[PDB]
UniProtKB/Swiss-Prot annotation, chain A:
One BP term from GO: translation
Signal sequence segment: none
Species assigned in the record: Tetrahymena thermophila (strain SB210)
InterPro entries hit by this protein: Ribosomal_eL38, Ribosomal_eL38_sf
A GO molecular-function annotation: structural constituent of ribosome
UniProt name for this protein: Large ribosomal subunit protein eL38
Keywords: Ribonucleoprotein, Ribosomal protein
Family the entry assigns: Belongs to the eukaryotic ribosomal protein eL38 family.
UniProtKB/Swiss-Prot annotation, chain B:
Organism annotation: Tetrahymena thermophila (strain SB210)
Protein name: Large ribosomal subunit protein eL34
Entry keyword Phosphoprotein: no
Keywords noted in UniProt: Ribonucleoprotein, Ribosomal protein
InterPro entries: Ribosomal_eL34, Ribosomal_eL34_C_sf, Ribosomal_eL34_CS
A GO biological-process term: translation
Pfam families (UniProt xref): Ribosomal_L34e
Curated annotation (Swiss-Prot), chain C:
Subcellular location: Cytoplasm
Entry's family note: Belongs to the eukaryotic ribosomal protein eL27 family.
Keyword Transmembrane: no
Pfam families documented for this protein: Ribosomal_L27e (PF01777)
GO CC terms in record: cytoplasm; ribonucleoprotein complex; ribosome
Name of the featured protein: Large ribosomal subunit protein eL27
GO molecular function terms noted in the UniProt entry: structural constituent of ribosome
Any single GO BP term: translation
Gene name per UniProt: RPL27
InterPro entries: Ribosomal_eL27, Ribosomal_eL27_KOW, Ribosomal_eL27_sf, Translation_prot_SH3-like_sf
Swiss-Prot record, chain D:
Family per record: Belongs to the eukaryotic ribosomal protein eL19 family.
Organism, as annotated: Tetrahymena thermophila (strain SB210)
Full-length numbering of the shown residues: 63 to 185 of 185
Record-given protein name: Large ribosomal subunit protein eL19
A GO CC annotation given for this chain: cytosolic large ribosomal subunit
Gene giving rise to this polypeptide: RPL19
Region annotation Disordered: where it falls in the sequence: 90-123
Keywords: Ribonucleoprotein, Ribosomal protein
GO terms under biological process: translation
Top-level taxon in the UniProt lineage: Eukaryota
Cysteines joined through disulfide linkages: none
RNA sequence: UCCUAAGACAUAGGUUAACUCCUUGCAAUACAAGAAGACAUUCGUUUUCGUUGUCAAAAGGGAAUGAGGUUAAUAUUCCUCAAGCUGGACGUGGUAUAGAGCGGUAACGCAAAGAAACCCGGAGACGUCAGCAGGUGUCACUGGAAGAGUUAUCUUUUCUUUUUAACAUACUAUGGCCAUGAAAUUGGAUUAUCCAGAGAUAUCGGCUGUAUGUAUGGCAGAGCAGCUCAGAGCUGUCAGUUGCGCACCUGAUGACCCUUGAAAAUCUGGGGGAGACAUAAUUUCACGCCAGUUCGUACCCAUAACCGCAUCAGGUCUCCA
RNA sequence: CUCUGAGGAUCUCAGAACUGAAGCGGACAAAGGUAAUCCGA
């Protein structure tokens, strides 16, 4: 499992059978890409990055929420 | 107090058979098999025995897994010798040829 | 007693360039605000010319001769002061540019020297007392 | 258990009649020594770092504590105050000279003891 | 299963009426015994280098996995989730070169940065004991929260839970190096030794090596503890401190020998630069595609599953506390 | 049992007083000595 700090690489990865898993925690939110040998997590604190990334969900990738 | 169980069918305590106690998300204390430590890489010259810098100390296998960096250094003998030995080598070779030529001209 | 002179061939001792031969362009007894220790500016053979047979062909003999020069600053302490000297092989005062070095022009000087050396090497004159040395400059040292 | 540790800490339950092991057995001498040495050396380091002592004083005192000359940390401290106060030159003296030096040192001591008093009054 | 050991056995040669017996790793009491490459791709052709076997370790060496869940009985094997390894074979990006990365004075650094014979290395790879230092697990204590025990009296009480796998990235880690400068009113330093002009100490100095360390990912969605509803639901799983405490591991040492403490397979590095190649050639970078066969996995391991004519007061090698 | 002092970081040691059927390593744990003679170091 790898995690990503900078949204850019994350977006290069979800731009590269693709599905995206978003999960809510009290203080934080996480976005999760499945790829052959790695599970990519992306965490953010503030709601701005949050909504912005929710926007970022493309038609190619389907969004699952737990 | 939690007690453990070997997981390997080798109950005898051997340097290769060592175990470490790990605490799981389950709340269990589980034996996990710990690997063996290896000796650091030393310069190969006679009587030298210096610990080489900038090379990884890794169990022999993992040596196929690492990046070129850890396998090497940038000198003339990067992997095999330390700087001191390199240096003394250079110097010795140069000066020895000098004496060689000198003997040559003194012969002719 | 001091021999730092422009044109003295020295060997680099420890460094990625350790074991290579090069000539002193400039010598700063105590150095700049930049390098606060005693150092020398030097131009030398990084990769030496490969051996050339009398049986090879044109393209072979030409390609064989390629030289890759380097220009480095080296603390004098990392240097072995060879007694061989080549002053005239080129004007290093001319081709070694404090500017070009600091100015991100490194590759330019590289080219210039490659040109110069390659030219000189095949042009080596067998009667030159300058040449007995020249050979050694392009010589390969054995450790 | 806790109640006992309580009383043991107040000191009610340690006695000779309550001790089964050797003094050395309970706490081994070597530990006490290591602890003392370590204290003394940590101190000498603080001091030599703060310029209060010089490399010669450092050395002499280091070998001082190595020689069990100082039981307390307090005592090493007193003897540092002494090396500072007494001139560290105690070589080649006639008894006249040492009497004089003694009285000069006694004078200094009295002096500063006095000041150290007066400053606490005004505060 | 592979590797080598103490060892052992073929083959070859010799001995015996014969059976049998003698040698063989430092390999022969033997010897016209091999391996590789390429084109060919069969042969053949051709090239290169060459004296000649095998078995013996379920504690030695030894490529890579973990947590959670499940059965009446198996599970580091099945399920779920998350990883790594070796061998394949191309795809897409990217390094490098008209010969073959770039930075630093230097230790050294950085996803990648051409190659054969050949010769040398490193790891593997190692005794006993003594003390020091650190880490893990455990034990102890502190505030918070949920539950439980006690309550005639006393007890802001007594107990319980309060967890984090392999693996990914970044940092720190007992040592060693590199500068600069050299030390006598010698200094530095350990519990102990011990080090220095063969360069000590010291610099807003620098480089490097080891985690059973820290943070984040894994991860809470799992596990754990409570409380509801009639399979669904809700709440909390938080923040600290100390130990010559204990078991194990690691790090730096010290002492000891008319004792001086395996080897090979395996992974990898260096020196060398013969060859190969323009529409080309070759390259320890990423991400993607394929595979992992055979055998053992139940259960007892003992005052009742073993050996002692037995369900015998005997005997029988280990780990966790 | 009630006090007192000393050793340390950003758990040991020593004093004094009081109190008991003069008991108190209260179980557990845990050498009996001495002087000679003979062997074998
Ligand atoms: Mg996978
Ligand atoms: Mg003890
Ligand atoms: Mg053998
Ligand atoms: Mg034999
Ligand atoms: Mg294995
Ligand atoms: Mg599996
Ligand atoms: Mg692969
Ligand atoms: Mg040893
Ligand atoms: Mg509590
Ligand atoms: Mg350090
Ligand atoms: Mg939950
Ligand atoms: Mg300890
Ligand atoms: Mg043990
Ligand atoms: Mg030895
Ligand atoms: Mg090489
Ligand atoms: Mg029995
Ligand atoms: Mg008393
Ligand atoms: Mg009394
Ligand atoms: Mg009694
Ligand atoms: Mg008797
Ligand atoms: Mg006897
Ligand atoms: Zn060396």
């Amino acid at each position: 499992p790898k995690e990503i700090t900078d949204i850019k690489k994350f977006m290069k990865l979800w731009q590269n059978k693709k599905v995206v898993y978003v999960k809510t925690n009290k203080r934080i939110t996480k976005f999760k890409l499945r790829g052959k040998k790695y599970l990519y997590t992306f965490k953010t604190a503030d709601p701005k990055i949050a909504k912005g990334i929710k926007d970022a969900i493309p038609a190619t990738y389907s969004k699952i929420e737990i | 107090a939690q007690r453990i169980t070997y997981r390997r069918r080798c109950s005898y305590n051997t340097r290769s058979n060592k175990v470490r106690k790990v605490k799981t998300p389950g709340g269990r204390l589980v034996a996990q098999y710990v690997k063996k430590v290896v000796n650091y890489t030393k310069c190969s010259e006679a009587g030298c025995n210096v610990a080489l810098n900038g090379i990884a100390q890794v169990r022999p296998a993992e040596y196929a897994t690492i990046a070129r960096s850890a396998k090497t250094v940038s000198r003339v003998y990067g992997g095999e010798l330390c700087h001191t030995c390199v240096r003394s080598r250079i110097i010795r070779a140069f000066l020895t040829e000098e004496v060689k030529i000198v003997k040559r001209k003194m012969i002719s | 007693a001091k021999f730092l002179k422009y044109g003295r061939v020295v060997i680099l001792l420890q460094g990625r360039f350790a074991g290579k031969k090069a000539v002193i362009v400039k010598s700063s007894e105590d150095g700049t605000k930049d390098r606060k220790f005693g150092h020398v500016l030097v131009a030398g053979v990084e990769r030496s010319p490969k051996k050339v047979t009398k049986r090879m062909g044109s393209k072979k003999i030409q390609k064989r001769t390629s030289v890759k020069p380097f220009i480095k600053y080296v603390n004098l302490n990392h240097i072995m002061p060879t007694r061989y000297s080549v002053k005239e092989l080129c004007d290093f005062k001319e081709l070694v540019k404090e500017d070009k070095i600091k100015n991100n022009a490194k590759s330019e000087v590289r080219d210039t020297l490659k040109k110069v050396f390659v030219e000189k090497y095949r042009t080596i004159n067998p009667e030159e007392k300058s040449a007995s040395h020249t050979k050694f400059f392009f010589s390969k040292l054995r450790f | 258990a806790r109640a006992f540790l309580e009383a043991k800490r107040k000191g009610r339950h340690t006695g000779s009649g309550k001790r089964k092991g050797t003094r050395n057995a309970r706490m081994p001498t070597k530990v006490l020594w290591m602890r003392r040495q370590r204290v003394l050396r940590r101190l000498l380091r603080k001091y030599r770092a703060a310029k209060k002592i010089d490399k010669h004083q450092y050395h002499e005192f280091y070998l001082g504590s190595k020689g069990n000359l100082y039981k307390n940390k307090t005592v090493l401290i007193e003897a540092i105050h002494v090396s500072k106060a007494d001139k560290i030159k105690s070589d080649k003296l006639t008894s006249q000279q040492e009497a004089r030096r003694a009285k000069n040192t006694a004078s200094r001591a009295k002096r500063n003891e006095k000041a150290q008093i007066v400053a606490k009054v005004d505060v």
